[PDB]
Design a protein around this ligand. Sequence first.
Ligand SMILES: NC(=O)Nc1cc(-c2cccc(F)c2)sc1C(=O)N[C@H]1CCCNC1
Length: 254
Amino acid sequence: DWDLVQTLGEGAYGEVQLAVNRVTEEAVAVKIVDMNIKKEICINKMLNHENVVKFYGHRREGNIQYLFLEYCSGGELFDRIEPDIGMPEPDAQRFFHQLMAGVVYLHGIGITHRDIKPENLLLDERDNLKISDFGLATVFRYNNRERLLNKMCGTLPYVAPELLKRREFHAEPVDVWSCGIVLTAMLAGELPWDQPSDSCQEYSDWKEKKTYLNPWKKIDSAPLALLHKILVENPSARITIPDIKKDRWYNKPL
Ligand SMILES: NC(=O)Nc1cc(-c2cccc(F)c2)sc1C(=O)N[C@H]1CCCNC1
């Protein structure tokens, strides 16, 4: 059926192989996991959008799952972020538009990803950004009724502060915050804090508006002003995606 040509990634999660069709030479990605995966499959089956990694199907051979996925030859966004520099501002803006499109799509169908970070955003052959790895994703809305979440999911530098502080919390502002951290990384090549908490010096400095320090001094006033609306501790005063779409920098031709 498919020839496994090479490893695209490996981790405790499992591995990702580039597979090439024996007859047609079509290339796809195959995520292989040795048995959570049932849910990842379930969620993947719900998705159809240009800014999400497309799911083609799956096959279970014993205890091993093979998920057939759209091959994104551009790799992880993470490898486009030059350490302590980031990337040109216009590329950052374009990737952010595309990230927003994907997140808007997921939220529209009541799905929250919960693990948004540059390692889980892939780039296709035309450098279009695609949301990847739905292994922590879940439903937060059923028939116009929202459920608040309580699970400790994600990676600390990207997680919203309410995740640590509150007994439960709305899904959407958590994904928005992580998108702001990804935006900061893209602009400055630097994560702003290890943990979103007052005991982290870099976090308090941000709340004390010390943007003369890194990474904020590397960032132009315009996108910086977007980041002040996104990286807001109180999730109820945090900017929503409909209002992100109205931000001056977001709409600035670059
Ligand atoms: N779908 C697809 O092409 N996948 C895909 C393709 C990748 C890739 C593409 C080109 C060059 C290269 F070195 C890697 S990496 C990757 C992937 O899904 N990695 C995961 C591992 C777990 C952490 N999140 C990213």
